[PDB]
Amino acid sequence: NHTAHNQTRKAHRNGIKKPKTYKYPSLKGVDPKFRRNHKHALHGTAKALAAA
Amino acid sequence: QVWGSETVASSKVGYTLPSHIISTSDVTRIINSSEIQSAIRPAGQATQKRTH
Amino acid sequence: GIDHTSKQHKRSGHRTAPKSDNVYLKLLVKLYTFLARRTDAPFNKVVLKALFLSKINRPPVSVSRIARALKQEGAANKTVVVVGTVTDDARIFEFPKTTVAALRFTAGARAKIVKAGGECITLDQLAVRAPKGQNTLILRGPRNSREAVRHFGMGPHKGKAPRILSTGRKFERARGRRRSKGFKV
Amino acid sequence: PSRFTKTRKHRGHVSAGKGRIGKHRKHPGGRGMAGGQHHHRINMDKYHPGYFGKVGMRYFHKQQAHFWKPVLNLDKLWTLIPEDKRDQYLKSASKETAPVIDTLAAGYGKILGKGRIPNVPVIVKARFVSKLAEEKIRAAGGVVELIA
Amino acid sequence: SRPQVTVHSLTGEATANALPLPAVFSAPIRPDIVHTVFTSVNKNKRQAYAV
Amino acid sequence: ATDVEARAVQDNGESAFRTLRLARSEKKFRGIREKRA
RNA sequence: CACGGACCAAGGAGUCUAACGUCUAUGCGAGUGUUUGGGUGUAAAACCCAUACGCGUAAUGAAAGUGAACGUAGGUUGGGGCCUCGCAAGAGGUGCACAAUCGACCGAUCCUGAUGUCUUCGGAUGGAUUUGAGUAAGAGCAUAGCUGUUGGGACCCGAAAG
């Protein structure tokens, strides 16, 4: 009936792993109103660097 | 005329004899070649002494 | 006694010789061990540690992958190194002259490379023309392009495939795959 | 090879790799895909989701010969030609005569669009075609001759 | 460049007419699969047994 | 045999995809259109 | 102060198969598989082989059905290695695989609904916090081996019963 004895040990054997952040994370939850404009902005910057 | 060669193809359909993976079997002729021995470092002491 | 931080007597999870018994691979191992020991180059070491690999971690590199590699800025006259197999690609129609070095060529890949003036080389002639790793371009094929990785991490909302044999509209499309029948997952 | 199996390495060890507390008993868990919505539910809902339900409608007496539409893209079209002649059709075809390709004899029922081709006129005989795959052929200089 | 091998007679004498080595003999000599093949090809002439 | 290997091209003004896409539709709508009369 | 076991010999218990997963070895490689069958034979072997078939090369949808390049097959960040300069440290360029990310393409769903049109057919175009076991210079097929899985007498012996 719910002993928690020997769970922390089992966790710490193979360790408690931090999530390993990245650069450029996901944009699934952000304001779509901002998502669209970002999509239009980056193409413009790509084009402006395609020349210069 | 059975197994074929570089010149004449086999009576066997769609059969070329297997291609080698290495050219020569005497690796020492490769090792003791001027291209290699003019590019490796100098050796020393197949078996070396017991310091301390 | 000793309070231990590390698992004791733990092998390094790498392999340091091929599980194969191809004597003509033992020889190239004998060779690149030498050229990795008695040299200050890492190309030799990379090739050594690549010869040990299994058939899925040592995949085929298409002749078009090659042609794309030679299209890079300045890589147009290098000599190319595949430590696997080099497979033809009929989707192309213009192949350069170059020099490819690899273990096994297929008979179409040899012929295209030869019809375009090039030559197909083994990794023993390449160590003669290039011990310290000169003008070389190492290529690797794709590993995640398999029918088996398609199922790894299979679970909910991961977007992966099930291990399955027969496909259709009756086979794993009903419940847990739409909102009408139960729920979606 | 039985000399290579782990039944040999377990001679001596009572409880031959199947345990002491809980043993190798005789079908615990049911026989088969049983308990798929009772006690194996959170496997069948994790690893095989889509089991347990009807979807779509029934086609009594399906013959899989009606639904013979193998695809080809515009990459293997020049593989259908024999290797000895596509040489002298590629560099050639600055002439008027154009190679003709019978995909139905190649074993194909539709041609598709994936990829590119050279600006070399062909004639392509097939019973089904995609829009992009006609657009590319006409652009090259060719034409499509529906058959059957 | 292909080497020659000389034709012997029934009396033991070597003739003059010598012959080029085929390409089979330059082929790779791979004991791994001459063995992997033999362990499966020496099984084909078997007769069943049972009780 | 079938037609001659390596003959000439007659790129006329038609579209094969559209032809098929229409032959499907007239086969579909023959019976409803003959009821329209 | 729980069970079996008086002693000895011999026998005695995770196997075989069908279909499969991961992993490894091998052959060939956008193909692969000879062996249902035929030819052949020193005769259940070995050797040779057409045509089809299977798996794979194209998915998606309940289905009709449609069906994968705006781009030096994209950009950004990292990335081994290679090249360049350097006494070296380092700087730059190139950057396969791989990982994160924004996009482009195919199909499905929702929306927009053009040229024309048997006047209701057709559906170009541009979109969408939607969706897919997808595309994006292919990676698989066959055999074999350990482990593992399901059904099979199924590790060996065992019921009351029907």
Residue B52, min C-alpha distance to chain C (Å): 26
Picking from E1, E21, E26 by the largest number of B CB atoms within 10 A of its own CB, the best residue to mutate is E26
Tell me the C-alpha distance between D59 and C168, whole Å: 13
Are the Cβ atoms of B18 and E28 closer than 8 angstroms?
yes
Are the Cβ atoms of C172 and D54 closer than 8 angstroms?
no
DSSP H or E run through D110 = strand D110-111
Report helix, strand or coil for C99: strand
Please report all neighbours of A, defined by 3+ CB atom pairs within 8 A.
Answer: none
Tell me the C-alpha distance between D26 and D100, whole Å: 67
CA B31 to chain centre: 10
Chain E residues touching B4 at Cβ < 8 A: 23
Tell me the C-alpha distance between C118 and C54, whole Å: 29
Are the Cβ atoms of F6 and D97 closer than 8 angstroms?
yes
Task: Give the residue ranges of DSSP H helices in C38-176.
Answer: 43-51, 63-69, 107-115, 126-129
Chain B residues touching E28 at Cβ < 8 A: 18, 20-21
In this complex, is the C-beta atom of F35 within 8 Å of any C-beta atom belonging to chain D?
no
Tell me the C-alpha distance between D89 and F7, whole Å: 12
Report helix, strand or coil for D126: coil
| D34 contacts: CB under 8 Å, gap ≥ 6 | D40
Task: Give the chain D residue nearest F18 (alpha carbons).
Answer: D131
Radius of gyration of chain D (CA): 29
Amino acid identity of D131? K
C116: which 2 tokens? 């375009």
In this complex, is the C-beta atom of F14 within 8 Å of any C-beta atom belonging to chain D?
no
DSSP at E32: H
Q: What are phi and psi of B17, to 5 degrees?
A: -60, 150
Q: Count CA atoms closer than 13 A to C157's CA, side-chain side.
A: 2
Residue D17, min C-alpha distance to chain C (Å): 24
> B21: closest CA among D14, C18, A27?
C18
Are the Cβ atoms of E27 and B17 closer than 8 angstroms?
yes
Residue ranges covered by each domain of chain C: 14-145
DSSP at D130: -
What CATH class does C14-145 carry? alpha beta
Are the Cβ atoms of D100 and F7 closer than 8 angstroms?
yes
Tell me the C-alpha distance between C53 and E27, whole Å: 25
Vertex C39, ends C38 and C42: CA angle to 5°? 130
Report helix, strand or coil for C96: coil
Amino acid identity of C100? V
Label the pairing between strands E14-20 and E4-8: antiparallel
